[PDB]
């Protein structure tokens, strides 16, 4: 027996994410499909997985939760759980729309309810620190939003689905100067230096669930972001080493989500004939970094580290 | 004779935009008109009141002005007596244009004066301090503006309206970073809980005002504005048990300006034929709140509190 | 021989973006043409000089080059150069297209590197401290981004500017909050307080960068804009005395950027019919504001102390 920690949710997001950019390329080229089918069964697996492990967490392991849920800085983590199982039920709506749909709205709920309770009560003073200041708070805070909007969306459901975005948007925008300026003061712990990959979610995150609101239309907004996106990105990638001073390590699949939300992204740029260089070129970037997450997984399922 | 309280003010504002939003409903339930010009007539005689015991306190308690007026966080709550004054104005606008035309200009130039002074001699540093990081400070910072805004536009000057409407959003996204991470780590005392109403101000003023200047269209940005401003309204209401920690009080009419907002804002909403069951619920749930206080507020000045 | 100071980039950069104010009113005041090219020339013959004097800085005081660089302040001012030079290019585009390309390319991708290389680093966090938190900040991250975005649309590229203003923009409220709040908290020292005027720059750069994108579609976005600078224009203002406490001084240039960019974007609101009273003020205002720098600049070019 053992308590799953909860950030591997990260793994079955970035894959499901990555699932629904493939299966936006069908029409473009049709053995997209396959791509996508073989990502979103791998990903629903896991998931599957990852929640009966955590259903035993939560069963013989429940201080742990409690503690996690607690924290004002490991609480975020938790929001991976209604998250990836919203994107599960956007892979599943190709198969079968009635369970699809029961996913979207317990992930809905769930990470409503989430947020309801605990990141309002930061507000109250004197649990949270300076120290707390991590761009894990982006999971509960703004994606958590962001995914309810598109999978709302993909339900029919546009105009509620433009409030959970706008939730997820301004909360974003509120949160980031704060998080930047902490950055920029106190140095990050090597430990946590792999979350660096979350400050890369919200503004691909947030152009992909707009995109998915707005009927796919690459209008000036979405132009915006895209390139905070790329600023960001580049910004990412010169801090790499410093990001991996003390070694390769699982965490980095924390950049699998917002690079799959950027792929998916890209596929709408692209259908949109907007920028199609910079979309191509974003969408096999995004796949060989995941694809590379994947060899360095196995290559270490292997000595037993996962 | 007593000094009165700058805080009151926030009554006749929440009374006077509560009546705006009944005005607003007149075509679609003509009875709407006798509710409006009833809260209108009330907010009117209470800010004509409380107008004339504040020349009472300038004349004669002038030492206390003065001192508020140079406090960085009491001198906010001065920007409510030009904030009323122009709903007051567009209350009056049905009876008299040209009467209501003067208080929209007065209250447009004192408030613009009043933030021109006071807000920017803040950024010459060392008065301001980290804890005088308040919520109060959107009353002359956002609120202010935004109410210019949708003013002007009454009286047809909706480009100057737009440029008021700017200054108020840019300066909220600019400031609320700040205050949630204040709030986050410092624990707001009791006596300011009340306060943490303004906090949902922001949003739904600053709908509420952008469909005042933009002729009630509906559109994308107004159904962003209104997820913030309900995500906040969940978080206020999570949060509530604690803001009434040390007992019910007449600062929670901080409450009323945002609730009446809100409802002004689900008008608009309605009349557009954009989710009008959440558009009934909320015109339903700010009108019961404010009538909670109202009569909490009779209540008392029974005991003769107030 | 002397290490020219680098912030002297200033100097041309605003009277080259004031060249460009002039240039979009030809067709309404054709002599308003000749006024550009003579402001035009002046800047590119000070730029083409100062290049000269940084690449002798370069070769002969590398280490003061070396220490600005590093500087988590100080390293801002070396983000002028590119500015400036594509600015020159905007210019020379009049005369010679090809000549203006080179320069446009050079300062895109030089900026871009600089904020990619220097920007990021300091997320590493310990080298920048709460104190360095300055409005020169603006310069790499939310000026350069703009330029980029203007000059791209200038040579045809739009869909490309968008990327660059939308990384300008959403850079510049992700920064002003922790800006504002240092400002509220500390007192910028008497020896910085002329680059409060660079605090003028990121609204009225933004909109003029998006005017040039967006072939001048004065629209709400743009009134917006436009609102929250004259807010920062009526704070600046009032602001003055305390920003000339310890005299009048050559760091005043830094307001010519932000006012030359102002009228810039009043030409476009002028010819789209929008505001055109407040449109000729502001025109009207920042040339005899750049005028009085030219003035003070030549009583004192004489004394020798420039
Ligand atoms: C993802 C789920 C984690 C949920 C753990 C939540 C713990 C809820 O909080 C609990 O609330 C009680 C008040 O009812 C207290 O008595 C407990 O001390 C407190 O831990
Ligand atoms: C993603 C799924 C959300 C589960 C969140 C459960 C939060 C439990 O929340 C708790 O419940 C108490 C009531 O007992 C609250 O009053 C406390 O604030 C809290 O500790
Ligand atoms: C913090 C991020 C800032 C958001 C910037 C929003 C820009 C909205 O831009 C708008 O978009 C429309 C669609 O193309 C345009 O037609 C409008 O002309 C323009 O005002
Ligand atoms: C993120 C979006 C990825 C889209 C992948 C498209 C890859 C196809 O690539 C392209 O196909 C076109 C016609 O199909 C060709 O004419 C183009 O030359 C070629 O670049
Ligand atoms: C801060 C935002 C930076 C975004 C930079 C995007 C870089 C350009 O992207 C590239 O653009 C070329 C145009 O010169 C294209 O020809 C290429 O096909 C494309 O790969
Ligand atoms: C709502 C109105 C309150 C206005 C009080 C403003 C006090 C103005 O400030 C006063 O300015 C003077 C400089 O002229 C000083 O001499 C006084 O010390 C100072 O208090
Ligand atoms: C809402 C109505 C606005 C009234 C604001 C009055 C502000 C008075 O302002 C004062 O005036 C002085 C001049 O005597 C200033 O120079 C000071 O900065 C200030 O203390
Ligand atoms: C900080 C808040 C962010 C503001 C987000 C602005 C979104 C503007 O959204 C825009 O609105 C128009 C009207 O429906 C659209 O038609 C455009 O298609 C879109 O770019
Ligand atoms: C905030 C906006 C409040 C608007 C109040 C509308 C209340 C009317 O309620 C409605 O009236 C319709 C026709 O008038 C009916 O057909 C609907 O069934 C009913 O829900
Ligand atoms: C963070 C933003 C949260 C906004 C949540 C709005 C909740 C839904 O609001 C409700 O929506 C229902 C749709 O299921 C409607 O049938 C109801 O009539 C309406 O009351
Ligand atoms: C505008 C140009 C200024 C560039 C100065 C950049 C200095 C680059 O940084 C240098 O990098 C080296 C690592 O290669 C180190 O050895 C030096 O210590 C370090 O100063
Ligand atoms: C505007 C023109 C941009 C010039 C920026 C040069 C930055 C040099 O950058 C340096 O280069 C090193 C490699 O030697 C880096 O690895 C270091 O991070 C840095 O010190
Ligand atoms: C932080 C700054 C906030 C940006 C606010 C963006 C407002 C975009 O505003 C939009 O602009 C369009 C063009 O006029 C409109 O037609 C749309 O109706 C509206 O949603
Ligand atoms: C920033 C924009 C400045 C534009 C300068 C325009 C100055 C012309 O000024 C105007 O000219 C009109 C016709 O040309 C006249 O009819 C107007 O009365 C007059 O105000
Ligand atoms: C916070 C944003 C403040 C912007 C205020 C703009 C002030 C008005 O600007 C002026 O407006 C008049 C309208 O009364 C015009 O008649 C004038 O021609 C114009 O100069």
């Avoid at 793994?11 to 699932?19: C, E, M, Q, V, Y």
């Avoid at 995914?147 to 949160?175: E, N, R, V």
């Avoid at 699998?256 to 949109?272: C, E, I, K, V």
Wanted: charged share 10%; hydrophobic share 55%.
């Amino acid at each position: 027996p053992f308590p799953l920690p909860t950030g591997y949710f990260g793994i079955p997001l970035g894959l499901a994410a990555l699932s629904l950019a493939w299966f936006h390329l069908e029409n473009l080229f049709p053995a997209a499909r396959m791509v996508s089918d073989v990502l979103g069964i791998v990903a629903s697996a896991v998931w599957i997985l990852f929640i009966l492990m955590y259903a035993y967490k939560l069963r013989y392991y429940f201080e742990e939760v409690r503690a996690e849920y607690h924290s004002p800085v490991r609480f975020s983590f938790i929001a991976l759980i209604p998250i990836t199982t919203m994107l599960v039920g956007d892979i599943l709506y190709r198969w079968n729309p009635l369970i699809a749909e029961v996913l979207i709205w317990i992930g809905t709920i769930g990470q409503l309810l989430f947020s309801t309770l605990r990141v309002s009560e930061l507000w109250q003073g004197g649990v949270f620190e300076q120290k707390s200041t991590h761009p894990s708070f982006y999971l509960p805070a703004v994606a958590a939003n962001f995914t309810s909007a598109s999978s709302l969306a993909l339900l029919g459901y546009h105009d509620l689905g433009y409030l959970f975005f706008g939730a997820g948007m301004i909360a974003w925008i509120i949160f980031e100067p704060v998080l930047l300026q902490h950055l920029r003061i106190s140095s990050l712990e090597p430990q946590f230096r792999a979350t660096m990959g979350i400050v890369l979610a919200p503004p691909f995150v947030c152009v992909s669930a707009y995109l998915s609101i707005n009927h796919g239309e690459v209008d000036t907004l979405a132009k915006i972001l895209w390139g905070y996106g790329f600023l960001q990105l580049f910004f990412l990638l010169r801090l790499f080493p410093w990001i991996v001073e003390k070694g390769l390590n699982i965490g980095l699949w924390a950049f699998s989500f917002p690079l799959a939300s950027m792929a998916n992204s890209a596929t709408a740029f692209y259908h949109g004939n907007v920028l199609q260089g910079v979309s191509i070129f974003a969408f096999v970037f995004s796949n060989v970094m995941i694809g590379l997450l994947v060899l360095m997984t196995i290559y270490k399922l292997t000595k037993g580290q996962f």
